[PDB]
Design a protein around this nucleic acid. Structure first.
Length: 86
DNA sequence: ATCAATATCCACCTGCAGATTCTACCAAAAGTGTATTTGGAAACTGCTCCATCAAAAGGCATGTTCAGCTGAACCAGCTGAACATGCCTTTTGAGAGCAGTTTCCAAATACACTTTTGGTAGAATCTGCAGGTGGATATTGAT
C-alpha cells in the first residue's frame, strides 16, 4: 500500500493508494533536474531506484525519501526512435 | 582523312509537388486638426583664397653607356589524369527541447529647471629640434 510513479514533470511521486483521494494530496515528492524514465522498487522494499534521461541515477531510501543516499552517474541519453532505458 | 563507340541534343507523355488563385479578417494607410518645430530669404563681416612678381636652386629633359635581365628552344623525368572494381560509406523512413508569443511589473531612464563648473579662446612665455659644422667610420667596387 505504497506506490511509486514517475513523470516528465521532472518529479517522481510516492503515493499511499488507500489514503489519498484529493488530486495531489500525495505522500511524498522527490524532484529532479531532468525527466525520469524509470522508478523501480527493490525486492526488499526499502531501496528505490530512479533513472533519468540525461545523465544520472539516484537511490532513495525508506528512511526520509527526500534526500538521496547516492548518485550513480552514467549516460543513457534519450532519443526519439530509441527505446527508453530502464 | 574515314568509320565505330558513345555521350549529348532533342521529340513525345504523365502526374504531382510546388504555383496560383479565392475568402474572412486585423494591423496598417490615410485624412483632420493642431501644435511644434525647422531651414531658407535678408543682411554683414573677416579669414582665407586667386592672379602677380622677383631672386635662386634644385629638379626635369635629353643623351651616352654598358651589366645584367626576359623570353625562346629543348628536354629528363615526374607526376598527375583515365579506368576496372569491389567495397564500403552515405541516403531514406519508422517524443521533449526550445524558438516563438504573451502579462505585466520593479527597475531603468528621458526631460524641465538651476547650479555649478572644467573646457576652450586667446595672450604670453619655454625649449627640443631643423639646421649647421666637422670628424670619424662603413659600405662598395677595382684590382
Amino acid at each position: 500500500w505504497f506506490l511509486a510513479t514517475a513523470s516528465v514533470d521532472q518529479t517522481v511521486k510516492i503515493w499511499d493508494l488507500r489514503q489519498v483521494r484529493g488530486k495531489a494530496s500525495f505522500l511524498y515528492s522527490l524532484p529532479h533536474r531532468h525527466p525520469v524514465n524509470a522508478a523501480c522498487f527493490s525486492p526488499d522494499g526499502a531501496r528505490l531506484l530512479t533513472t533519468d534521461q540525461k545523465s544520472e541515477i539516484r537511490v532513495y531510501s525508506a528512511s526520509q525519501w527526500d534526500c538521496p543516499l547516492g548518485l550513480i552517474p552514467h549516460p543513457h541519453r534519450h532519443f526519439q526512435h530509441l527505446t527508453p532505458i530502464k
